[PDB]
Amino acid sequence: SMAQKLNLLNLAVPPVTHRSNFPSTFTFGVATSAYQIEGGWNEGKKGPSIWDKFTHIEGKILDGSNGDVAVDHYHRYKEDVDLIGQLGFGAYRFSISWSRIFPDGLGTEVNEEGIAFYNDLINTLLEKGIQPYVTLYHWDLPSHLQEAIGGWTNRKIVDYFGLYADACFANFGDRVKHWITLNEPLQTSVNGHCIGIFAPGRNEKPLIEPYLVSHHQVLAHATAVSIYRSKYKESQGGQIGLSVDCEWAEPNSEKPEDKVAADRRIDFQLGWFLDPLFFGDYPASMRQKLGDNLPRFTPEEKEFMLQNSWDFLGLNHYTSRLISHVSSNFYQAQELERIVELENGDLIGERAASDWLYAVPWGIRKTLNYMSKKYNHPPIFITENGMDDEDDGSASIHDMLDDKRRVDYFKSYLANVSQAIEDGVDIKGYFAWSLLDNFEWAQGYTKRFGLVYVDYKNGLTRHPKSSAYWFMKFLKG
Numbered sequence: 001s002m003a004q005k006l007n008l009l010n011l012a013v014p015p016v017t018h019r020s021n022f023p024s025t026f027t028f029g030v031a032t033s034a035y036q037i038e039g040g041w042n043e044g045k046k047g048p049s050i051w052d053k054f055t056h057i058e059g060k061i062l063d064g065s066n067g068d069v070a071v072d073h074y075h076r077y078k079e080d081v082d083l084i085g086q087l088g089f090g091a092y093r094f095s096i097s098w099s100r101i102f103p104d105g106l107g108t109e110v111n112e113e114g115i116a117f118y119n120d121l122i123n124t125l126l127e128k129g130i131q132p133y134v135t136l137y138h139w140d141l142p143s144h145l146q147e148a149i150g151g152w153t154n155r156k157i158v159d160y161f162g163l164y165a166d167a168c169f170a171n172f173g174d175r176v177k178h179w180i181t182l183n184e185p186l187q188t189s190v191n192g193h194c195i196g197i198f199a200p201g202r203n204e205k206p207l208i209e210p211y212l213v214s215h216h217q218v219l220a221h222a223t224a225v226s227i228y229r230s231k232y233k234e235s236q237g238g239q240i241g242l243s244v245d246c247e248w249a250e251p252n253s254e255k256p257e258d259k260v261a262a263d264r265r266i267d268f269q270l271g272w273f274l275d276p277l278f279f280g281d282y283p284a285s286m287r288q289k290l291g292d293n294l295p296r297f298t299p300e301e302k303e304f305m306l307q308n309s310w311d312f313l314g315l316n317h318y319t320s321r322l323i324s325h326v327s328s329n330f331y332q333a334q335e336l337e338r339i340v341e342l343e344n345g346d347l348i349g350e351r352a353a354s355d356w357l358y359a360v361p362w363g364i365r366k367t368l369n370y371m372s373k374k375y376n377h378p379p380i381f382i383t384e385n386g387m388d389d390e391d392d393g394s395a396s397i398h399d400m401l402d403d404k405r406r407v408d409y410f411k412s413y414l415a416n417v418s419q420a421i422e423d424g425v426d427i428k429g430y431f432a433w434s435l436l437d438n439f440e441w442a443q444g445y446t447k448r449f450g451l452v453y454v455d456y457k458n459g460l461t462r463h464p465k466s467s468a469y470w471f472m473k474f475l476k477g
Contacts (some may be wrong), residue, residue, distance in 0.1 A: 013361070015361065017474070063445060078124055087451070096134055096172075165224035230377070307375045321340065406451075435451060451471060
C-alpha cells in the first residue's frame with residue numbers, strides 16, 4: 001500500500017544528521033528578505049513598494065500588521081550579522097529593496113543612501129567572514145512602477161529590472177559573488193495577480209495577468225543573467241541563479257494517470273519558469289491546456305533565454321503532496337487534487353503553523369533528484385527550507401523558544417539533503433528560512449519561522465531558540 005511505501009521512505013533516511021555528512025566545502029546559511037525584516041520603510045529616501053501600499057489597506061493582512069518597522073533590521077543589522085556569525089553560518093541570503101536603490105523604479109538616478117546601507121551591511125558580513133547571497137527581487141516592486149505601467153503585467157518591466165540589476169552588480173559585485181535574480185516568481189504571478197492575496201492584490205484578470213507576469217519575470221531573469229555575464233562576470237567572478245519554490249508531487253497511486261498528473265503538477269510549478277530557459281519554451285502540458293492565454297516567445301527571445309538560463313538553481317522547498325488526476329483557473333487547468341491523508345486516515349506528515357506546510361522530509365530528496373535529472377545535473381542550492389510556529393500575540397515566549405518540532409524538521413530534512421548528495425545531486429549549499437521571526441506576508445507576524453525569536457512585546461529583542469543552538473552545535477561538528 002501507499003501507507004507502507006511512504007513509511008519505508010521515511011525509515012530509509014532516519015532523522016539524524018551531522019556536519020560530516022556534507023562535503024567540507026558545503027555552504028550553510030540563513031535567509032531573510034528585505035520587506036520581511038528591514039523596516040525603515042520611508043527612511044534613507046526609500047520609495048514605497050507595492051507591499052508598503054498593500055499592508056496599509058485594512059483587511060489585507062491577517063493580524064492588521066505591516067512592515068513599516070518589521071524587526072527593524074534597517075537599524076539593527078550589525079547585531080543581526082554578529083548573531084549569524086556566532087551561530088556559525090558561513091553565508092547569509094538577503095534581498096535588496098529595489099525602492100531603496102531607485103525609489104520610483106525608473107532606473108535613472110541611483111539613491112546613494114540606499115547604496116550606503118547595503119554597502120555597510122555587505123562590509124559587516126565580510127568582516128565576520130560571512131558570504132553574501134543577494135536576492136535582487138523578493139516581491140517589493142516599487143509602487144511607482146505598479147501605478148505607472150502596471151508592474152509585471154507590462155513588458156517594459158523587463159528593462160526597468162535590467163537597470164536595477166545592473167546598478168546592483170556595479171555597486172556590490174566586487175564583494176557579492178552569488179546573485180539570485182527573482183524569488184518565487186510562481187507566488188508573484190498566482191497570489192499576486194490571480195487571487196490577489198499578495199501585493200499588488202490583483203484578481204481582476206485571472207485568466208490573463210498571471211501568465212503575463214510569469215512571462216515577464218522569466219524574461220527579466222534572463223536579462224539580468226545576460227547583463228551579469230556580458231558586463232560583470234569576467235572581472236567579478238561570481239555566479240547568478242534564481243530561486244523557485246516547488247511543493248513535491250508524489251503520485252497518489254500506481255495508476256498511470258496519477259504519474260502523469262504528478263509530472264503535470266511539477267510542470268506548472270517549476271517548468272513554467274525553468275523550461276523556457278532550458279528548453280526554449282513553456283512545458284507542453286501548459287501549452288496544451290492553456291492555449292492562447294499563455295504568451296508565445298519570439299525566436300529572438302528563445303535564443304536569448306537559452307543563452308542566459310543560470311549558473312545554479314535555487315530551490316525553495318517546504319512541503320509535499322500526494323497527487324490524484326481529476327478531469328484559481330491556474331489550479332483548475334492542472335486537473336488534479338492535492339492530498340495529505342492516506343486512506344488509512346494518517347497524514348503524510350505533521351502540519352506546522354501554516355495551513356499548507358506539512359513536514360514531509362523525503363519530499364526534499366525527491367525534488368532535488370527530479371531537478372538534477374531534468375535539467376542536466378546543474379549546481380543546486382536549497383535557498384529556503386524551514387517551518388513556522390503559531391503566535392497570534394498570546395503564545396508563551398517559552399513555548400516559542402523550546403521549538404523541538406523545528407529541530408526535528410531540520411534534522412529530518414537535512415538528512416534527506418545529505419542523501420540527495422549521495423544520490424548524485426550537485427548540491428552546493430543550504431539556507432534555513434529564516435534567521436529570525438519576521439513579517440510573513442498576508443499572515444503578518446502570526447507565523448514565526450525564525451531560528452531566533454523576536455519579541456514584538458518588548459523592544460524587538462532577539463532570543464535564539466533551541467533550533468538556533470542546535471544549528472550552532474551542528475555547524476561546529
